């Protein structure tokens, strides 16, 4: 009954011990090493995930379970899945399992699951933060401060209050709903697009108006927020043509997945001023290389992939990961909303 | 009965024309020049405000009305008031009139008024954006992006969700109340201190609790927000001893006035880790010199003085300044809430 379990996390070095609940890094490995080893399982943890000769690849031929995390994602390709002779279970410590080839996982009969709900508040907070950072023009003020400069006009000419502006969320699942709730008291005109309409009473509490056809919402928005998974349909959806339909000077927030946008289409439209500003924590690929052009374009307010891995989020997704492992050892089903691929079927929000 | 009117604003140069509503700079000067010249008055506008030899000091001897603005503040000292033989009226385009020597103004019988309520939503927004930026640790992420780095752990060890944290506002007048209303859906433990308690219905809607004694509220707070005027009592109030009563690792937001804090006492407690981070738009003095130490201390999330001068704020304070000039010319009283010094008496919020 003893299994080989591999975890792939970001490496913390001297940061590992600066908070007692820092469960998300390599060194602390979700807090589950002792619990796993006491049951006779082998637990191997690494950040070394790229290429033929990395530590992860050493263990791909015989691991049983692979625990990944979106902030430092192991890319589980069709070729890796074919090499993986004993693999049965792919767990995501966090939310969003698109770093796996989900079609090849379904074709191989693998189970893919994630900790649904675990960091959705955290991302909704970070999104509202970035809307404010772009609208109110925080980044150019910070840059003046560190360079020893002082020029209020260089900031004020394009700074605005959020009050009275039109904000559209593209996707209204768990995160989009939590965002709409936090935006209610700012006094904005809220719109949303999804394949699924929110309940009548949630529309009434938030004041948010359903727009069934995405192309009708886009031109109306001063602010657009991305809030869908990375799926075969959403991949590359914000291309040259779709971005042309946005209001001139639109501010875009994207803490969903970087690859929902076409990389170069965003760069070109930022340089022309057609996108007024772009802010998010997600990139294609991750880690983002040193030369990734989103780092250097005008008006950018980016960070690395951090919003779903606050300390409070880490505690919840480590706990959910442990619960699923415990269920797995006992042959019990996970909560239904956790499955992304089960019995060869993809979950509806990814179809 | 035609008057010399002087305006002191920040200079925009090429930025002036980038927005048709950019009324807060020298070049557009609240949009009132034609209006004032058509009535036979003279309107001298300048940003040059420092020392014996600046353009402002040339007009001090014979001006009738001086319009100042907090973002680029003319320091109207006792020595200046004495030299000002014709001066009758000091108007603040924005909110907070502490850049005037208010005791010398009272002594000389000068009227001091400002545009109450004009940018209070704007600052409430900017405060909440800063709580998020400090709590969720945005600034180190931005810094890594522009330097070409990628290290998630270096940000995540210190990042938390705002949900469930304790936040205290020191002051609950116009801005403090608007902040509390916007914090409500984040699910925090909200406390406030003021000399005046809020209406019970407002306490209930926001969920904020009155703490009558300031010293009792302070050690309880993860986040402290400064929300009072700069007055004889608030000036230097956050000194070595008062900062010591704060929780270790406290995050502080101050978009009120810089001099409410002792400058070096903030530097020391930030260097020690007693203050975990400090964020605001306001400084002593302004413009802040190149070597001001708040620009360079650990964890700082500063900007120049911007939050009360968004485009939407400028439209409101330009209109309120124009309205008080019209009343002035007709011998009519300003709205009661606009007066800071009238008949040699300070307004109650400054006492
Ligand atoms: N930055 C972070 O740290 C972080 C953390 C968590 C999640 N995320 C990303 O955000 C995503 C959303 O999270 P959630 O909890 O809100 O997910 P959710 O499943 O609850 O909501 C997704 C929504 O997308 C809609 N949708 C799917 N395909 C669509 C399409 N083609 N057109 C229109 N609507 C479509 C679905 O109907 C659903 O309401 C995750 O999949 C993940 O990729 C990022
Ligand atoms: N950063 C900006 O752009 C910007 C913009 C507007 C205002 N401000 C600053 O914010 C201040 C507050 O603005 P407002 O509209 O909320 O003012 P307000 O008059 O409505 O509120 C001031 C509050 O301070 C309280 N107070 C005064 N002295 C006190 C003391 N010693 N102890 C406890 N409470 C005390 C009063 O009871 C009052 O409720 C302004 O005076 C200004 O200096 C900054």
UniProtKB/Swiss-Prot annotation, chains A, B:
Function comment:
Catalyzes the NAD(+)-dependent oxidation of formate to carbon dioxide. Involved in the cell stress response.
Site features described as Important for catalytic activity, chain residue numbers: 257, 305
User: How is activity modulated by pH?
Assistant: Optimum pH is 6-8.
User: Cellular component terms, GO, for this chain's entry?
Assistant: chloroplast; cytosol; mitochondrion; plastid; thylakoid
Quaternary data: Homodimer.
Q: Which Pfam families match?
A: 2-Hacid_dh, 2-Hacid_dh_C
- Tell me which CDD domains the record gives: FDH (cd05302)
GO biological process annotations for this chain's record?
formate catabolic process
The record lists NAD(+) as bound by 174-175, 194, 229-233, 255, 281, 305-308
Which reaction(s) does its UniProt entry say it catalyses? formate + NAD(+) = CO2 + NADH
Organism of origin is Arabidopsis thaliana (Mouse-ear cress)
Q: Which family does it belong to?
A: Belongs to the D-isomer specific 2-hydroxyacid dehydrogenase family. FDH subfamily.
**GO molecular-function annotation terms?**
formate dehydrogenase (NAD+) activity; NAD binding; oxidoreductase activity, acting on the CH-OH group of donors, NAD or NADP as acceptor
Keywords recorded for this protein, A-Z: Chloroplast, Mitochondrion, NAD, Oxidoreductase, Plastid, Transit peptide
Where, per UniProt, does this protein localize?
Mitochondrion; Plastid, Chloroplast
InterPro entries assigned: D-isomer_2_OHA_DH_cat_dom, D-isomer_DH_CS, D-isomer_DH_CS1, D-isomer_DH_NAD-bd, FDH_NAD-dep, NAD(P)-bd_dom_sf
Instruction: Quote the EC number.
Output: 1.17.1.9
Give the enzyme's main class according to its UniProt record, as a single word.
oxidoreductase
Expression induction per the record is:
By one-carbon metabolites, such as methanol, formaldehyde, and formate (at protein level). Strongest induced by formaldehyde.
User: What gene does the UniProt entry assign to this protein?
Assistant: FDH1
Q: Which residues bind substrate per the record?
A: 95, 119
- What is the protein's given name? Formate dehydrogenase, chloroplastic/mitochondrial
